[PDB]
Design a protein around this ligand. Structure first.
Ligand SMILES: Cc1cc(C)c2c(-n3cccc3)nn(CC(=O)NCCCN3CCOCC3)c2n1
Ligand SMILES: CC1(C)CC(=O)c2c(nc3nn(-c4ccccc4)c(O)c3c2-c2cccs2)C1
Ligand SMILES: CC1(C)CC(=O)c2c(nc3nn(-c4ccccc4)c(O)c3c2-c2cccs2)C1
Ligand SMILES: [Mg+2]
Ligand SMILES: [Mg+2]
Lengths: 335, 337, 339
């Protein structure tokens, strides 16, 4: 719980109303009750603000005349919402102290205030920085290093020789450092190429659940600082992702792709490897990326949904588009 | 467990034709069935083949009966009867039995009657497990989550905090329920985390396949209706709502704040945009690219399917240059007119 | 781990040019290699660059040898020799060693010789682990499953009940073998679960990537042939059959009752529908949408690639309206045919 005046100071917002109001939590506009702070970004909600029962609403200056409660005025209500949600966060920690059921190699190096959940398994040579939290059931493999403040939720798998920076967060079910998909061929028989590169994850990286980031073949798979990666993503061996890039859910990246900084990869895209994407590229959902991208901007692919009856005809005609092209050329030749 | 054919027929509401004292030990396919097995026929093309089936009994329709070469259970719907007799004769083990000494259970967790928790599972403070709940080995159930009576988690399932799961659900291994939604604000190119303090509410009789992820909501909740079935490796983003009885096939990716109605069927590997709605009674065929809201019931499809590579190269290049093709068509129309 | 260059050369059947007493400690890329490392060259464009490489030895071909600025191992196939030498010098640790005290092992489980079981792994009743099997930390192996000699599971792999895994397999973390297939009947609008009492049978020398799911069959079995390699995040549905030596790249989804032949190559993120067959020696390129059986060997492809968004908007609009284009073309043809 926090006083509205104090909250507004920490958010650098201008208070309009009783600064003695006690705020206990954040809520959506429709769910907010007495004691909740909420926010609005879309002007369509201005008109029924009198129906919102929050104790305070974060809004812009042009929103103030419509306010029907205490208001915090800011330039960017969505960013201010992020900040106040952090102040008022109710999310528990993955673990507290070291659990008696955790299995920790005696050669592990642990910083101060490290927490390790029940039945986690820490291999030899592992280094956990100050304030690192390892959730229940995790595995951290030989000689891996996790920087100060980083946290793994329950049932995360980190392989050997992995480096993770400071203040990272990895959601459950994710696997960092599995073998890349590397094989030679000896007369139709696959020959395993041991994958002895690593994964290097920078600072302030957030990785979702059931995502996989393979280790490099010789040199490393690299995730830059400030990168966010959603659930169900595959990052193949020797991918390099530049700082602050965002990868939405279900994206598949093939080996040796290089993505620049400040990119935004839409959900379920497929990005082929051994190529580069420059800084500040957006690929919309399900994008089929077959070629290098050398200019910033938004790129898209795919023929979207139609009623099945229409789709049958669309797909049949497209599959015969070479015959359509030949017919058009013949008609030109004749005319 | 073995059962007399007469008793099985009564529990299945089937008409017995043959020896009621035959002992049935299990269910098998028609081609694999051996003595002691019961099987079923749905395709009358196999009538002439029944003499090759070594099952002790065969489920079939009244129209099939004259072709039987075994004891027969006559029913209106052999497939549904098959589902029912396979449940009666199910050989699937339970994920756990009793409470394992290696399980780690907070003293404040509330266990109902006949709860089983497998080896090395971890149950946080405040968790409530209803009567007959089974938690498989190596699971994690986070603080204050609640799992309704008769629900079962296979091994290595992760439930975060404040999750609500209904009665008689079944969740396969590797599934993660309640991870943070993908919520971030952008500050001059840097991502600022938005804590995800909503929940997941899963209804009654929900089945979730392996390595599916259902994220918790940002403020309000991600909601899965009753009777929903979800296959493997689906992503259900924060604040998605899925209506009762909807089926989601394998590998479907949903963006945040999608609402799917009741009675929908979403084909495998489909991709669905967020912040929009799909109405009731919609079927999306496999690999559907769902970019826009769906406002009328019915069947919807997308995608240009496989061709020989040499052919595909021309299809792809021509489609990519279809604007030029369109302009050439228009120009030729003007010249001819 | 370390080995004299002469001994390494013999084991690789390579011709040594240089000092056989050099001690090799590991493999590295050309750019990262330092004293003690062996590396390899496959691209002759780097001949002029070998003077910048600080490896103790470089694997190359006879045609490369005049360009060497180091001890050289001459072979016919530097890439294959690289794979073999990386195995000889492999630094990958084992998933476990010995039987961990925190593992929970049913009294009826049967273990071969030199089995290792990692911390907090859980082994159900009736399980049989062959000689030299390694089960990683936190794994689950369900009732009556059998894992053949030499096979290894990394940490946090889930094997359900009645699963059979052959010899010398390797399964990466987060993978789930034997979950229920997606089987349900319909009772007046209510889903009715169909128990999935088939199994999964995995052959010898199968490698399966991370967070891959392979479901058990409904009555008969899901089958993975020998020598199959499967990447991360793949989904193999109930009753799929995959033939020997087929490769499946990452994020591939296969629907129920698909049969894939031998020596196939399925590109990443492909979607393969079920109740159909793909013959031997078929390559499906990445993101392929497979809706129909494939009866002839060769290379097959689908998908319309990326364009700038403003261009894609016009492409998509025109394609979605292609029936009108087809009608206009037919009408124009009739006019030109004087009809
Ligand atoms: C699942 C999904 C599915 C479809 C079909 C589409 C879509 N679409 C519109 C036309 C063609 C595709 N657009 N989008 C949204 C989208 O891709 N935005 C750009 C990337 C967002 N960044 C922000 C931070 O995280 C990383 C990702 C989608 N999403
Ligand atoms: C739930 C049910 C008993 C019936 C059903 O509707 C269904 C089932 N299994 C499926 N597998 N795949 C699939 C999986 C992977 C790749 C490609 C396709 C579908 O698309 C499936 C569908 C659907 C078809 C159209 C919409 S949902 C079993
Ligand atoms: C098994 C092997 C040694 C050789 C191989 O054939 C192969 C390999 N790695 C791949 N990654 N991706 C991929 C991954 C993610 C997104 C997009 C593409 C492919 O499609 C891959 C393929 C194939 C190409 C065509 C058919 S299979 C390594
Ligand atoms: Mg333990
Ligand atoms: Mg996918």
């Amino acid at each position: 719980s926090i006083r509205l005046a104090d909250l507004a100071q920490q958010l650098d917002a201008e208070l309009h109303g009783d600064g003695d109001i006690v705020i206990t939590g954040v809520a959506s506009m429709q769910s907010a009750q007495t004691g909740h702070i909420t926010f609005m970004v879309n002007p369509k909600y201005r008109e029924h603000l009198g129906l919102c029962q929050a104790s305070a609403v974060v809004m812009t200056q042009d929103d103030l005349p419509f306010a029907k409660s205490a208001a915090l005025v800011v330039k960017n209500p969505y960013l201010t919402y992020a900040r106040m949600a952090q102040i008022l966060d109710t999310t528990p920690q993955p673990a507290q102290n070291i659990a008696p059921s955790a299995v920790i190699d005696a050669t592990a190096k642990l910083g101060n205030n490290v927490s390790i959940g029940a039945n986690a398994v820490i291999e030899s040579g592992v280094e956990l920085g100050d304030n690192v939290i390892i959730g229940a059931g995790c595995f951290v493999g030989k000689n891996s290093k996790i920087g100060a403040g980083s946290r793994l939720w329950a049932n995360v798998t980190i392989y050997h020789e992995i480096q993770i920076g400071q203040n990272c967060l990895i959601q459950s079910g994710t696997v960092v450092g599995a073998d890349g998909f590397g094989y030679a061929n000896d007369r139709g028989n696959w020959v395993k190429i041991p994958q002895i590169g690593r994964v290097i994850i920078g600072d302030r990286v957030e990785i979702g659940a059931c995502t996989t980031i393979d280790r490099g073949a010789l040199d490393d798979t690299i995730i830059g600082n400030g990168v966010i990666i959603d659930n169900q993503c595959q990052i193949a061996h020797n991918v390099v992702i530049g700082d602050n890039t965002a990868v939405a859910g279900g994206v598949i990246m093939a080996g040796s792709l290089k993505i620049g900084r400040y990119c935004m990869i839409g959900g379920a895209s497929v990005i082929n490897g051994h190529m580069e994407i420059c800084d500040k590229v957006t690929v919309t959902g399900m994008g089929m990326v077959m070629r290098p991208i050398t200019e910033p901007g938004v790129y898209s692919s795919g023929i979207p949904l139609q009623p099945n009856k229409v789709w049958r005809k669309t797909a049949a005609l497209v599959m015969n588009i070479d015959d359509m092209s030949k017919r058009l050329k013949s008609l030109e030749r004749k005319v």
